[PDB]
Design a protein around this ligand. Structure first.
Ligand SMILES: O=C(O)c1cccnc1C(=O)O
Ligand code: SF4
Ligand SMILES: [Cl-]
Ligand SMILES: [Cl-]
Length: 303
């Protein structure tokens, strides 16, 4: 295989230098295939809680690399491309959060994991798409401040009956902005297929789906649903993951949807990363000390 030179050298260096390689589900198939662990934000966060290796190569976007570092402040965490980020997250700021606490006095601030680590220092609790409902239901408030994703916030409201105030204005993931007509069309084409979409999708999309959940949840659906065909409303990287796990089923994208940031990592710069042992994720001590609290609290409010 023509990538064997990079694949072989990555595997050698990883072992030689004592790295574990963690990848997100939206990484290119070639990177998923060389990772030690591949999963969603929640699964990655969980894995980061119990991590033994001294050195971590993280393949995803910066806010999750920073979460991994916050949970392992004394381990070396590296990323191939330091610019790999979530633009959604970058629109929420400390000032907006402070504005909204002042405005809504006793509302806890629940932040999605794609949020800056500085914003995490100001959060009461962190969540991901699979635990947001449970976490919000455990809080002793019928109103919460939630960001930066409006769709997940609005989903949480529907599921909890709580009032959810979303910040910032129109915070959303461009990648999950599917149109509901794509479901109408795929119903005609494959009348027996099951449609699975992410909670970051717009309401009309979620409402027409058979299932709504995190990518981690999506991966488990075929364990209990015998459907030959699944239609997947999330980033294209998930198709590879699903088809690997369930070679016996068909996985059809709802639409082609690519996160440019998730695609910044390549075989070539991942190799470079292991050769140079760069770029290290470095955070101020203060930020680690403060942001760890809403992160640990997320796991406390699941189990
Ligand atoms: O794994 C996730 O939480 C996830 C789900 C949908 C979109 N983006 C992400 C991400 O981490 O960027
Ligand atoms: S898929 Fe969406 S939410 Fe996830 S990193 Fe990309 S822009 Fe951010
Ligand atoms: Cl978990
Ligand atoms: Cl997810």
């Amino acid at each position: 295989h023509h990538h064997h030179h990079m694949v072989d050298e990555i595997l050698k260096l990883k072992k030689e230098k004592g790295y574990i390689i963690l990848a997100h589900n939206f990484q290119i198939p070639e990177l998923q295939d060389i990772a030690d662990f591949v999963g969603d934000s929640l699964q990655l966060a969980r894995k980061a809680m119990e991590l033994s290796e001294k050195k971590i190569l993280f393949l995803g976007v910066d806010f999750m690399a920073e979460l991994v570092k916050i949970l392992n402040p004394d381990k070396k965490v590296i990323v191939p491309d330091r610019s790999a980020t979530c633009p959604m997250a970058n629109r929420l700021t400390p000032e907006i959060i402070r504005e909204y606490r002042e405005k809504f006095p006793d509302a806890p601030v629940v932040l999605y994991v794609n949020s800056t680590s500085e914003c995490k220092t100001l959060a009461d609790v962190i969540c991901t798409s699979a635990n947001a409902v449970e976490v919000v239901k455990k809080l002793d408030s019928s109103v919460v401040i939630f960001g930066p994703d409006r769709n997940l916030g609005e989903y949480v409201a529907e599921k909890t009956g709580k009032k959810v105030i979303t910040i910032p204005e129109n915070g959303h993931c461009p990648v999950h902005q599917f149109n509901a007509e794509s479901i109408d069309a795929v119903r005609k084409k494959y009348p027996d297929a099951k449609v699975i979409v992410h909670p970051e999708c717009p309401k009309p999309v979620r409402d027409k789906a058979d299932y709504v959940g995190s990518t981690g949840q999506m991966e488990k659906i075929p364990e209990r649903d015998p459907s030959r065909i699944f239609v997947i409303g999330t980033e294209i990287g998930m198709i590879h993951k699903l088809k690997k796990k369930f070679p016996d089923r068909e996985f059809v994208p709802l639409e082609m949807a690519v996160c440019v940031n998730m695609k910044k990592n390549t075989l070539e710069n991942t190799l470079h990363a292991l050769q140079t042992e760069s770029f290290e994720v470095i955070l101020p001590k203060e930020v680690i000390e403060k942001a760890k609290k809403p992160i640990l609290r997320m796991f406390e409010l699941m189990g």
